[PDB]
Write an enzyme that holds these catalytic residues in place. Sequence first.
Site, PDB file in Angstrom:
ATOM      1  N   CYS A  37       0.860  -1.215   0.000  1.00 39.36           N
ATOM      2  CA  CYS A  37       0.000   0.000   0.000  1.00 39.36           C
ATOM      3  C   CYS A  37       0.884   1.250   0.000  1.00 39.36           C
ATOM      4  O   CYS A  37       0.450   2.329   0.350  1.00 39.36           O
ATOM      5  CB  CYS A  37      -0.882   0.000   1.251  1.00 39.36           C
ATOM      6  SG  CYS A  37       0.118  -0.434   2.695  1.00 39.36           S
ATOM      7  N   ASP A  39       2.797   2.686   1.973  1.00 38.40           N
ATOM      8  CA  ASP A  39       2.495   3.524   3.167  1.00 38.40           C
ATOM      9  C   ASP A  39       3.648   3.418   4.169  1.00 38.40           C
ATOM     10  O   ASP A  39       4.080   2.338   4.522  1.00 38.40           O
ATOM     11  CB  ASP A  39       1.205   3.031   3.824  1.00 38.40           C
ATOM     12  CG  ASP A  39       0.964   3.804   5.121  1.00 38.40           C
ATOM     13  OD1 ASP A  39       1.852   4.535   5.526  1.00 38.40           O
ATOM     14  OD2 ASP A  39      -0.107   3.652   5.687  1.00 38.40           O
ATOM     15  N   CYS A  63      -2.561   4.143   3.193  1.00 37.63           N
ATOM     16  CA  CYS A  63      -3.629   3.119   3.007  1.00 37.63           C
ATOM     17  C   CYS A  63      -4.988   3.726   3.364  1.00 37.63           C
ATOM     18  O   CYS A  63      -5.071   4.797   3.931  1.00 37.63           O
ATOM     19  CB  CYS A  63      -3.351   1.920   3.915  1.00 37.63           C
ATOM     20  SG  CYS A  63      -3.556   0.389   2.971  1.00 37.63           S
ATOM     21  N   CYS A 106      -1.013  -4.073   6.668  1.00 37.25           N
ATOM     22  CA  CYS A 106      -0.874  -2.870   7.536  1.00 37.25           C
ATOM     23  C   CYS A 106      -0.749  -3.310   8.996  1.00 37.25           C
ATOM     24  O   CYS A 106       0.105  -2.843   9.723  1.00 37.25           O
ATOM     25  CB  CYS A 106      -2.108  -1.979   7.376  1.00 37.25           C
ATOM     26  SG  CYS A 106      -1.943  -0.982   5.875  1.00 37.25           S
TER      27      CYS A 106
HETATM   28 ZN   LIG Z   1      -1.976  -1.307   3.492  1.00 36.82          ZN
END
Ligand SMILES: [Zn+2]
Length: 134
Positions: A37, A39, A63, A106
């Site tokens: 993502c 991030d 994200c 994440c």
């Molecule tokens: Zn993510």
Amino acid sequence: MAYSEKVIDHYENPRNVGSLDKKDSNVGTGMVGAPACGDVMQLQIKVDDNGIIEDAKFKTYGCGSAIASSSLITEWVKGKSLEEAGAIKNSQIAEELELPPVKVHCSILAEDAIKAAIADYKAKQGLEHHHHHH
Ligand SMILES: [Zn+2]
């Protein structure tokens, strides 16, 4: 301060970041990233209340969900002992949010963050003995 009130012409403004003096000894830092993502998650733990996390800062954006995980792990690891912060693992916070598996990337970063910060904090503790070799 003091009766005299004609000095100070810049308003008490902060001139630091999220660490005291980067001297470690009580500040675990961790900055991981997720190429999935795109991030960057930067976590910052602070210990002082007698080995307890006197405070904890966070900083992540990219994200469409992690932006919330930071609020949780942040409102969960604030004023607690590292024994609880370094245990929530990533499967726990994930169950607290209830998000798809292909999106647990994440959550993994969040956990890998609390671990990197603690590992970096103990790195300056003095638990080193004869650097390994091979
Ligand atoms: Zn993510």
